[PDB]
């Protein structure tokens, strides 16, 4: 229910802007992004939570933003260990983190 | 409420235990600690009587030179050196306790304490001459 | 630090009901929640529940409603601020359908609004 | 002018006595209380000095839990419960002295004493709050 | 830059030594001087711990009851009567030292001690007036 990016890409040193958005079910003003990056079948990484709070020691060039209807993570400045999928997620602070589509970068 | 007591929330978030900061200063000095013999027990208690205040003094003397004095949370001039503690704010106040990020900023005390001390000895200064029309 | 080593990646057959381990270090277990997740192939990523090792409460999906035991034990002091734990997860009716890989991770922050967030993860388990 | 001495207007109304703060408060630790010979006056002096810093601190420290570090007149925010007192403002500041005021205060003494110690926590509270911009 | 030291602008003009009040101020109290045995050594130091926190209280005393509690440099409202000492800015904080000044203001240090501490006791009853609308 949480649609995310079907698939972008970009180069070395450029940037790409993901997406996230949903009905009012899971989204948005109401509620929290988070952003995992998760290569396929491996341990999962924390990028960003409070839609737009890093965690600690992620990179800079990773930015996230919310609208009213749509979240987004920016990810500046393009390095060979980009190419992993990401998946976003919806929360409260009291609830479940109900998972995105996914994107592949 | 709540109320935990003295040091009730001693393993309570930084933020959490900055709320009940009244609880552990009105104990700084009281407890049980009329005349004054001489004997093992009354030469043992005058002892903790007086290093009750010391300890107490020495506090308040700090906090006097720092321009908080009969302060429980006052702010400052001087910026975060990242180097001493480049932890966020986040991952801060609603994570670390008081007692383990007393043990990672004890290298620094010292450096801040002295930071702390000029900061307050210019802005005297500062005032002053502000005044001085 | 933290660490969360994950049980072995074993499998079974339909109608069966196996228990996943997750054992911590490195960091006070009852500080954190212990949330767990599965990533199927024939779905996206899914969040299963979340348990308190301080406060025994639990939280889970309602697509895993009744069909899911979570506990965890009691932790071991190592020192001040060290613990290990360990946390267990069960299915009930349970199918083929459920295959994938299967992972532990740590709540965030000890409070705010991301307390149970799903910070620190475990290497996961194969399954059937 | 007056000037009445140490505890002087000891019989005169609270509005007097209001005025004449200074008098008392800076014989609060001075007196006559240099080497400590461990004689019975000795013995008798040195307890005299411990006493008399002890007893002006405990009431400096709670000055200072209520914000009222080095004052004489501080204003709070902490209402007049009338249970406490339903006496008007005429025939209290102008009627009764401080003396027999204490002795009908005396019961709730204990319960303002906590009242101004909270609001001072939530007040440190809400200061920071407002300079986080 | 300089750092004298605890006393290292004794020689110093006034407004050089203005400038190092710090430096004098964290000594106070501290120094040197864990159980208490009455030998002769532990009397002798006994009696040192409890006049350091006498003295150092003696002078906070002061402090406070002029409105000027946890300041290293605060102005007063009363005026300088020329009689204390008819120099002159320029040839007082360029010129004198602490010393030879605290040497001829001697006389007068006690006249300008009530000064300012009835002027403290009527400020701040007219601060209570100010805000009782
Ligand atoms: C000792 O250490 C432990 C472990 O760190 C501390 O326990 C943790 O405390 C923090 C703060 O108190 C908790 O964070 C909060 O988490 C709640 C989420 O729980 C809510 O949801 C449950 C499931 O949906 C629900 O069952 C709860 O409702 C009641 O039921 C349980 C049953 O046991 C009961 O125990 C509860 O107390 C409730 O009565 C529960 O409501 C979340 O809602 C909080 O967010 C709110 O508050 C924050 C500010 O605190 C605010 O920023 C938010 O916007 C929101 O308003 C908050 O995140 C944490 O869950 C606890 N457990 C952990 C971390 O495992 C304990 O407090 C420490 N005590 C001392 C004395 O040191
Ligand atoms: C941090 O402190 C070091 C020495 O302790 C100093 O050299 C450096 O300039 C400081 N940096 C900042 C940003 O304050
Ligand atoms: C909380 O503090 C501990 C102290 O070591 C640290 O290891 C941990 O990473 C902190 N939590 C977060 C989310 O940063
Ligand atoms: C403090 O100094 C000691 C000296 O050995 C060092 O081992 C430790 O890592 C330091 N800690 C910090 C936080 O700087
Ligand atoms: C989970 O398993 C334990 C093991 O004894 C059991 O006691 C408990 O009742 C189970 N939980 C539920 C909800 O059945
Ligand atoms: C007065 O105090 C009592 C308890 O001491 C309390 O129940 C009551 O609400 C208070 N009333 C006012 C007006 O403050
Ligand atoms: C204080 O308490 C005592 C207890 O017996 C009571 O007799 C007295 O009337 C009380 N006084 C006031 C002013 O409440
Ligand atoms: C100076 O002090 C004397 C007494 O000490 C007083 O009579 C005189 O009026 C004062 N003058 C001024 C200008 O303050
Ligand atoms: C102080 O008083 C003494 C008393 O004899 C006098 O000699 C001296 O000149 C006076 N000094 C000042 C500065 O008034």
């Known amino acids: 229910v949480l649609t995310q990016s079907a698939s972008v890409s970009g180069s070395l040193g450029q940037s790409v802007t993901i997406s996230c958005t949903g009905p009012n079910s899971v989204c948005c003003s109401h509620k929290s992004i988070s952003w995992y990056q998760w290569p396929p079948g491996r341990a999962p990484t924390l990028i960003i939570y409070e839609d737009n709070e890093r965690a600690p020691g992620i990179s800079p060039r990773f930015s996230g933003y919310k609208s009213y209807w749509s979240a987004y993570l920016t990810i500046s400045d393009l390095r060979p260990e980009d190419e992993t999928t990401y998946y976003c997620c919806s929360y409260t602070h009291n609830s479940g983190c109900v998972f995105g589509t996914g994107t592949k970068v | 409420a709540v109320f935990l007591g003295f040091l009730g929330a001693a393993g309570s978030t930084m933020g959490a235990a900055s709320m009940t900061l009244t609880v552990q200063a009105r104990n700084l000095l009281s407890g049980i600690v009329h005349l004054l013999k001489l004997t093992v027990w009354g030469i043992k208690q005058l002892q903790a009587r007086v290093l009750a205040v010391e300890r107490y003094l020495r506090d308040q003397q700090l906090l006097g030179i720092w321009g908080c004095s009969g302060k429980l949370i006052c702010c400052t001039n001087v910026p975060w050196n990242s180097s001493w503690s480049n932890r966020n704010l986040s991952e801060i106040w609603d994570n670390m306790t008081w007692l383990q990020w007393d043990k990672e900023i004890s290298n620094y005390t010292q450096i801040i304490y002295g930071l702390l001390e000029e900061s307050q000895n210019q802005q005297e200064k500062n005032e002053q001459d502000l005044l001085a029309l | 630090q933290g660490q969360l080593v994950q049980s072995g990646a074993t499998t079974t057959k339909p109608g069966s009901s196996v228990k996943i381990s997750c054992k911590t270090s490195?960091?006070?277990?009852?500080?954190?929640?212990i949330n767990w997740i599965r990533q199927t192939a024939g779905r996206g990523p899914e969040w299963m529940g979340w348990?308190?090792?301080?406060?025994?409460?639990?939280?889970?999906?309602?697509?895993?409603?009744?069909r899911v035991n979570m506990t965890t034990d009691t932790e071991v002091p190592v020192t001040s601020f060290t613990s290990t734990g360990a946390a267990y997860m069960e299915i009930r009716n349970l199918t083929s359908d459920d295959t994938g890989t299967y992972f532990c991770?740590?709540?965030?922050?000890?409070?705010?609004?991301?307390?149970?967030?799903?910070?620190?993860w475990g290497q996961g388990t194969l399954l059937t | 002018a007056v000037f009445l001495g140490f505890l002087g207007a000891a019989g005169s109304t609270m509005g007097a006595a209001s005025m004449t703060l200074t008098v008392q408060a800076r014989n609060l630790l001075s007196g006559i209380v240099h080497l400590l010979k461990l004689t019975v006056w000795g013995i008798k002096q040195l307890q005299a000095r411990v006493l008399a810093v002890e007893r002006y601190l405990r009431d400096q420290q709670l000055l200072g839990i209520w914000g009222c570090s080095g004052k004489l007149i501080c204003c709070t925010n902490v209402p007049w419960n009338s249970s406490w007192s339903n006496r008007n403002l005429s025939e209290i500041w102008d009627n009764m002295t401080w003396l027999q005021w204490d002795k009908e205060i005396s019961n709730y003494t204990q319960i303002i004493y906590g009242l101004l110690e909270e609001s001072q926590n939530q007040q440190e509270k809400n200061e920071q709050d407002l300079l986080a911009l | 830059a300089v750092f004298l030291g605890f006393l290292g602008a004794a020689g110093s003009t006034m407004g050089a030594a203005s400038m190092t009040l710090t430096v004098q101020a964290r000594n106070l109290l501290s120094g040197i001087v864990h159980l208490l045995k009455l030998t002769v050594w532990g009397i002798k130091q006994l009696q040192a711990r409890v006049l350091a926190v006498e003295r150092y209280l003696r002078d906070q005393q002061l402090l406070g009851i002029w409105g000027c509690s946890g300041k290293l440099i605060c102005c007063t409202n009363v005026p300088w009567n020329s009689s204390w000492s008819n120099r002159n800015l320029s040839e007082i904080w360029d010129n004198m030292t602490w010393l030879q000044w605290d040497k001829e203001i001697s006389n007068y240090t006690q006249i300008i001690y009530g000064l300012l501490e009835e002027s403290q006791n009527q400020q701040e009853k007219n601060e209570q007036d100010l805000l009782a609308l």
């Open positions: 991770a740590k709540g965030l922050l000890r409070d705010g609004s991301s307390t149970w967030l799903p910070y620190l």
């Open positions: 348990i308190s090792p301080y406060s025994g409460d639990k939280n889970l999906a309602p697509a895993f409603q009744d």
């Open positions: 490195g960091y006070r277990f009852n500080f954190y929640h």
